[PDB]
């Protein structure tokens, strides 16, 4: 399984998600989904996973 995210939702935070199995992070950061006006439509969780 691989998580699925939007490009703008993770830009600048790839190095934390790349090493989540070696280092022992207290948490993982992510942004929310925003539309063209700047309103929040979805949460900070990944959209889904592959099967």
């Amino acid at each position: 399984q691989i998580p699925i995210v939007g490009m703008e939702q993770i830009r600048g935070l790839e190095k934390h998600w790349e090493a989540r199995n070696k280092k022992r992070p207290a948490f993982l950061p992510l942004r929310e989904v925003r539309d063209k006006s700047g309103n929040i439509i979805a949460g900070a969780t990944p959209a889904g996973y592959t099967q």
């Binding site: 600048g12 935070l13 934390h16 280092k23 022992r24 992070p25 207290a26 948490f27 993982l28 950061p29 942004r31 006006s37 700047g38």
Partner: protein, 150 residues
């Protein structure tokens, strides 16, 4: 490298982006009430020493007084974020309300500032957690069981 960002220039940026004092549609230049803006900037930096954390701002030494010609000490990568946050705390002086686009721009710049400060503290071992025999704690290292402190 590049030119230094002084105070007052941040205040002038804040006043210029809501049509209060500029050369875009203004023949009524700003008063000498820049002191209020500079003091607001100083206090808001003092507050920022807590939540966003330190970012390199240079405070006034001794009693003195800020003045708009002093160097701020901030990198040029932060001026949009600082200016928008300052603008949000200055509109009620003139009895004005922000528009949605200004709010969106302020949020984007603040997010860019937040991205350049993350730490993700990376939690440790337990302290009484054993270290296995594969690490050969007799000869190579010492102190079987993790230190978990330091």
């Amino acid at each position: 490298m590049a030119t230094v960002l002084t105070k007052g220039e941040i205040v002038l940026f804040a006043l210029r982006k809501f049509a209060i004092a500029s050369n875009a549609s203004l023949t009524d230049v700003e008063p000498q009430s820049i002191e209020d803006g500079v003091n607001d900037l100083e206090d808001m930096m003092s507050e920022w020493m807590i939540n966003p954390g330190d970012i390199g701002y240079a405070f006034a030494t001794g009693d003195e007084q800020p003045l708009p010609d002093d160097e701020s000490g901030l990198p040029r990568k932060y001026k949009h974020a600082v200016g928008y946050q300052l603008l949000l705390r200055m509109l009620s002086d003139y009895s004005l309300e922000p528009t949605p686009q200004v709010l969106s721009n302020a949020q984007r710049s603040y997010d860019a500032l937040m991205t350049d400060t993350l730490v993700v503290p990376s939690m440790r071992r337990r302290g009484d957690f054993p270290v296995g025999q594969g690490n050969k704690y007799d000869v190579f290292t010492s102190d079987r069981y993790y230190p978990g402190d330091l």
